[PDB]
Write a protein that binds this ligand. Sequence first.
Ligand SMILES: OC[C@@H](Nc1ncnc2[nH]ccc12)[C@H](O)c1ccc(Cl)cc1
Length: 167
Amino acid sequence: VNSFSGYLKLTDNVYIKNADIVEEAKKVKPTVVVNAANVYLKHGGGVAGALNKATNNAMQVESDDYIATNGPLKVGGSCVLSGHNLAKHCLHVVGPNVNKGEDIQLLKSAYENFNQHEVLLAPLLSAGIFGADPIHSLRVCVDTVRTNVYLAVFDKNLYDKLVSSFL
Ligand SMILES: OC[C@@H](Nc1ncnc2[nH]ccc12)[C@H](O)c1ccc(Cl)cc1
């Protein structure tokens, strides 16, 4: 039993809710919140820009030190950093950004990072400004993630299409 509330159950382990991931993380304070990161951990917009704003830019400061030490992530890769005031940890996951020409096949590799954590609050990878079809992203999530994932979908219109079209 966990404190996630108001989710629709899609499968044994995947759940979905129309919610602002920023407001969700603040309420739940989950062990792990997933960020829709880029390889440079430049949290300028989309989910990443919103999560970083909620940390008063502390996420960006920590991320800049991480990159200065370690260099960029791989597309499909991840790193674990602090969750600041939002969660215990933030799993920064890089899904392919279609608006950069990155291979959508790397979306499965991106979701595999979730399997290293028993429970996560997360967005759909490569959705929003990363340009992929959120329906496809949900399919890859369900077919790849085996741990317990709570998906927050900001857009109410998009949520209904994902539920109604889910196989
Ligand atoms: O796939 C993640 C979505 N974005 C967010 N998801 C959850 N919580 C969030 N908080 C701030 C942004 C955000 C994506 O960017 C998106 C945005 C608009 C539309 Cl129409 C469709 C898809």
